[PDB]
């Protein structure tokens, strides 16, 4: 059977906020809405475009399921991705522990169904990020739609 929670996180998301515990060298100019496709076998496929230096990176990432609901793995187990819903509606928080580009990085991402920034959602996102120990800047990102 497929996870009701896994289906609940499927579809179009706007990537809004983005805390960290380390500086991220590459930053996209703007990002395309994120799409989460629930697959048979509990795995989530995830696509986003990052417009950066005036060019479109077309990301595709598969979050492999685990024994713990909420915990997904990617990049051949190199990155963990916890997925939790916000108390604010139409908003989720990703929390990516792991390492990428040969560098250990802890990020948090604020997902929203609607592009309209919610100051209540951002507040809660900060509070959480700080509690987890992500105490850097909070990039609210530019939401473009196409290249």
């Amino acid at each position: 059977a497929l996870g009701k929670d896994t289906v609940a996180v499927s579809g179009k998301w706007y990537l809004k906020a983005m805390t960290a515990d380390q500086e991220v060298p590459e930053k996209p100019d703007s990002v395309t809405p994120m799409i989460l496709k629930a697959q048979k076998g509990g795995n989530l496929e995830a696509k986003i475009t990052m417009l950066t230096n005036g060019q479109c990176q077309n990301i595709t990432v598969v979050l492999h399921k685990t024994s713990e609901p909420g915990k997904y793995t990617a990049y051949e187990g190199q990155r963990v991705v916890f997925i939790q819903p916000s108390p604010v509606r139409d908003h989720y928080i990703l929390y990516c522990e792991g390492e990428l580009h040969g560098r250990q990085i802890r990020m948090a991402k604020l997902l929203g169904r609607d592009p309209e920034q919610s100051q209540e959602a951002l507040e809660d996102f900060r509070e959480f990020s700080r509690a987890k120990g992500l105490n850097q800047e909070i990039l609210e990102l530019a939401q473009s739609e196409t290249c």
Partner: antibody, heavy 126, light 107 residues
Framework: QVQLVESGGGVVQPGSSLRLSCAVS????????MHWVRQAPGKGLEWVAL????????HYADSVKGRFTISRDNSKDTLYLQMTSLGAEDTAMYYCVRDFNQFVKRFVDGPAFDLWGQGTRVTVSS | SYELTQPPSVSVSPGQTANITCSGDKLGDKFTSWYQQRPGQSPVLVIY???ERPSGIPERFSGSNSGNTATLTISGTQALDEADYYCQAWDTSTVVFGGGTRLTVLG
């Protein structure tokens, strides 16, 4: 208040370019992957094309690929199927359908057509 | 290309359970959907995501997708169920439909 209703149906000649259109109510067409499905008289169902909620993502059957176009006007809340270079094979009852597992708040990799139009018949002959 | 396969025809008596089957490689790794097309009507989704039933559809209908075949099962089969059932699944950036199974409730 029927949710999907097709139009553009009638008669055409091999050298034609009929455009079908599906008028939607109850939901926005920007919100769902929307598919066209033909059924020939006597024959069974045959998927023609889909357009994702992305609106940029469009796939067609190889049978029709190159000849057909799918598109939608979110403002008019209508979905279109531009049939060109019409063959005798194309003659069928054309349905527009909504992939309910291709929604902005539910994308499951398992197409499911909950909403079925009432169709519109197309006959191709010079 | 990828092709689903169903018996052209199935026959059952009133009450007897009916078993329509769908066959293809990588099924059970794929999600299947079932449609009922009653005589002269439009198609109607009866089973989605292999086993999941839409609302309104009676409990008599049930799904299964074990291995390389998928089955639509109709208990308490009665006149109303007489129709052409089609299975469908996604592959190669295409939606594949089966050829359908005319189900006759022998009366």
């Amino acid at each position: 208040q029927v949710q999907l209703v097709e139009s553009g149906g009638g008669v055409v000649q091999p050298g034609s370019s009929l455009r079908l259109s599906c008028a939607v109510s109850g939901f926005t067409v920007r919100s769902y992957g929307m598919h066209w499905v033909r059924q020939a008289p006597g024959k069974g169902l045959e998927w023609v094309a889909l357009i994702l909620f992305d609106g940029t993502t469009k796939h067609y059957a190889d049978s029709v690929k190159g000849r057909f176009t799918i598109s939608r006007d979110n403002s008019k809340d209508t979905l279109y199927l531009q049939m060109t270079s019409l063959g005798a094979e194309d003659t069928a009852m054309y349905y527009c359908v909504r992939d309910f597992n291709q929604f902005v708040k539910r994308f499951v990799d398992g197409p499911a057509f909950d909403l079925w139009g009432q169709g519109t018949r197309v006959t191709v002959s010079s | 290309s990828y092709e689903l396969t169903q018996p052209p025809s199935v026959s059952v008596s009133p009450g007897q359970t009916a078993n329509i089957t769908c066959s293809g490689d990588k099924l059970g790794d794929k999600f299947t959907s079932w449609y009922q097309q009653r005589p002269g009507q439009s198609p109607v989704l009866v089973i989605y995501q292999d086993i999941e039933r839409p609302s309104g559809i009676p409990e008599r209908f049930s799904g299964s997708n074990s291995g390389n075949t998928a089955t639509l099962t109709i208990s308490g089969t009665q006149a109303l169920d007489e129709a052409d059932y089609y299975c469908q699944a996604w592959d190669t950036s295409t939606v594949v439909f089966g050829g359908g199974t005319r189900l006759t409730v022998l009366g």
